[PDB]
Design a protein around this nucleic acid. Structure first.
Lengths: 120, 72, 100, 96, 171, 55
RNA sequence: AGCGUGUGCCUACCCUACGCCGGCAGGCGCGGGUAACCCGUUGAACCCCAUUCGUGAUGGGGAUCGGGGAUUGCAAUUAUUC
RNA sequence: AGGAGUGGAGCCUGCGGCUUAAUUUGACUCAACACGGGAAACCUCACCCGGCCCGGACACGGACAGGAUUGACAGAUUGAUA
């Protein structure tokens, strides 16, 4: 019900914010990932999100975009996106919610199915 | 503890995910703050959160040989 | 004048006969000679499984290569050296002449 | 093997000026320890000279990571007409 | 020198150097009777002697092959131009050098000669050559599918102890 | 371009970067003393390099 | 204490003293060592001396797990390690 | 005669089993099971899902400079500015 707040700042204030203060906003592993820099193979994914987001009618959630990049940080721009994260066999569509900020896309694309020993 | 000149790196809850306030949590808030982050990782359907939902090792231990006691 | 000569060799006696050969030419020149400084030897240890595969009882090896080194330094100009250095040197011994 | 002809003419006369040239077996090597003046990708050079013995102009030998192309007497005559050089010159291994 | 590697690494390096020559020459000069090499140190000059049975057969036509071999060692190892030289000396009492007698035997069976007939011809030959005793063991598939092993031995021949290191040479 | 996915993945470290100088495999390699020779290719060349099974 | 090891043909990658910053991991400067030379007189633990605890799953034990901070790497989520 | 243990506990790791797109595989009394020097994030890698390339010499028949035949940023495609 209440607004989502990340360390004490709400969603709309994240998006209009540069990265130099976004590093010290959250975890050490993530800020070192951004302090080390991104790759053009990864920048090419971000533009594919805005390309998929402005092409969405305002009452429809945007188009599905697929990727093999399980090693991408959920930064507050990717909110509201249908990413087809690759498992290794298939692309499982998951919708980014604001609560997934600061994690990897691979975390929500399970690679194995859970085991159940009884009842074949 | 803050105004009593206690450093930030002593606190069991540093940089909270909601309020980001460096606080120490004490024995009643501790366990309720312990099922908030657990259920937060479950609603987002994170792999780390589902491992708690299933009762498995989450920090990436080999479950093939150990962890048998509660598992009948 | 204070020049240093290094004698490193894998074989001991082939070093010993060279470490004594430079002495034959230096007292030939009748000048003050430094005694052959015996340095502590270095042994190169390599232990590996005898087996190409990973089967059988676990047995190992003890491949070594004990290297020896001797130092002799002389108070002599350069031309007196390079006439002695070129006499009766065996391939197993490596000489290192240090002018300074 | 659609690699530039400017790389053939160079290596054949590199093969002529010296009776034999070495090349370590490494397809992921843009360079050469000997032919370091220009690009001349290594994976093209070995599979250029294997087209020399498939016809029968050179020899072969291996040294755990290395090729040795000894061109034959029938190979030097192939150099005189293919790169058009006079019959006066012979490789450095034919001159004492 | 340039990078100045340590004393431990250099002595290991020339061991790798001498190793790669022996194999390269064993794969190339065997049919001309290659029997090992030896390096002799000299400032800016490394002469390597190729001890071979047929010295006239390793020079080829007008000493060309020795010039063909000095070329590859000049490019493979990156030795400076005119820094290293090769020679071709005769193997004394070639009947005693084991690796000389194994490759000589290797070409008899490869000629199609009988496995028994070949073994006696090389075993008694090194007997008139003045040996103390020898053992020629030929394994592998013989007289069918299942592999057996002939072991043709004569004379005095020891196995254990330290003397095996310098009284016996194997091939 | 095909050359950007043929060797563009960095091989400046890891087991896929070093290889035996004889056996050319990536298992049992002796990187000590700068050998870069696998333990199996090392054994038959143990003595001509100069190592001795002394004691 | 005693075994060792240490800047790499390809090789892009060493072992570290000292001075500063930080609780820590670590970071920033400067130098030494291709090594009986510098790390390094290798100030290692155990042990020894002196406090606290007091037979209590206890200051025994440190599994599991939360939050945070670093380092290596193109990349760590199925937590690389710290 | 004894010492210290293992078997019990937690954890590490190897094997079987089960599970799985795949959970690569070798070895099963001594003489298999911290063994393949096997401490696998990529690589390794042999497995699985996909996706490029020919790095199919050589010889023989057509096609071919009136061109046989390589590479190429755009847009769509793709994971990838293959």
């Amino acid at each position: 019900f209440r607004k989502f707040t990340y360390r004490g700042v709400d969603l709309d204030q994240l998006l209009d914010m540069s990265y130099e203060q976004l590093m010290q906003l959250y975890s050490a592993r993530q800020r070192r990932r951004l302090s080390r820099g991104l790759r053009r193979k990864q920048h090419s994914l971000l533009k594919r999100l805005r390309k998929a987001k402005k092409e969405a009618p305002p009452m429809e959630k945007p188009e599905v975009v697929k990727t093999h990049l399980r090693d991408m940080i959920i930064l507050p721009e990717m909110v509201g996106s249908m990413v087809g994260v690759y498992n290794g066999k298939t692309f499982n569509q998951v919708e980014i919610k604001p609560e997934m900020i600061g994690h990897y896309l691979g975390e929500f694309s399970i690679t194995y199915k859970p085991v159940k020993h009884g009842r074949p | 503890p803050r105004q009593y000149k206690i450093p930030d790196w002593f606190l069991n809850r540093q940089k909270d995910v909601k309020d980001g306030k460096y606080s120490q949590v004490l024995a009643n808030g501790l366990d309720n703050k312990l099922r908030e982050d657990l259920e937060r990782l479950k609603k987002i359907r994170a792999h780390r959160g589902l491992r708690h939902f299933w009762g498995l090792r989450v920090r990436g231990q080999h479950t093939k040989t150990t962890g048998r006691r509660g598992r009948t | 004048h204070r020049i240093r000569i290094t004698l490193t060799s894998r074989n001991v006696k082939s070093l010993e006969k060279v470490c004594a050969d430079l002495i034959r030419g230096a007292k030939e020149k009748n000048l003050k000679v430094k005694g052959p400084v015996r340095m502590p030897t270095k042994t190169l240890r390599i232990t590996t499984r005898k087996t190409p595969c990973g089967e059988g009882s676990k047995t190992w090896d003890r491949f070594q290569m004990r290297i020896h080194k001797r130092l002799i330094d002389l108070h002599s100009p350069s031309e007196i050296v390079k006439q002695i250095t070129s006499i009766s040197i065996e391939p197993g011994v490596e000489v290192e002449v240090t002018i300074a | 093997m659609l690699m530039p002809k400017k790389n053939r003419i160079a290596i054949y006369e590199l093969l002529f000026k010296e009776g034999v040239m070495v090349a370590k077996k490494d397809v992921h090597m843009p360079k050469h320890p000997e032919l370091a003046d220009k690009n001349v990708p290594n994976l093209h050079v070995m599979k250029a000279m294997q087209s020399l013995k498939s016809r029968g102009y050179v020899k072969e030998q291996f040294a755990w990571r290395h090729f040795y192309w000894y061109l034959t007497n029938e190979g030097i005559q192939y150099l005189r007409d293919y790169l058009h050089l006079p019959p006066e010159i012979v490789p450095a291994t034919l001159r004492r | 020198m340039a990078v100045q590697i340590s004393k431990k690494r250099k002595f290991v390096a020339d061991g790798i150097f001498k190793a790669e020559l022996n194999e390269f020459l064993t794969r190339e000069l065997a049919e001309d009777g290659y029997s090992g090499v030896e390096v002799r140190v000299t400032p800016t000059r490394t002469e390597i002697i190729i001890l071979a049975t047929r010295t006239q057969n390793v020079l080829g036509e007008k000493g060309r092959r020795i010039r063909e071999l000095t070329a590859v060692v000049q490019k493979r190892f990156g030795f400076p131009e005119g820094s290293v030289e090769l020679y071709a000396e005769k193997v004394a009492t070639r009947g005693l050098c084991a690796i000389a007698q194994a490759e000589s035997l290797r070409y008899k069976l490869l000629g199609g000669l009988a496995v028994r007939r070949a073994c006696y011809g090389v075993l008694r030959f090194i007997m008139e050559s003045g040996a103390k005793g020898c053992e020629v063991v030929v394994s592998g598939k013989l007289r069918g599918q299942r592999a057996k092993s002939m072991k043709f031995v004569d004379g005095l021949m020891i196995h254990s102890g330290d003397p095996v290191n310098y009284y016996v040479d194997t091939a | 371009g095909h050359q950007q996915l043929y060797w563009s993945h960095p091989r400046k470290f890891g087991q896929g970067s070093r290889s035996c100088r004889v056996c050319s495999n990536r298992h049992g390699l002796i990187r000590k003393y700068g050998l870069n020779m696998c333990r199996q290719c090392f054994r038959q060349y143990a003595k001509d390099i100069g190592f001795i099974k002394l004691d």
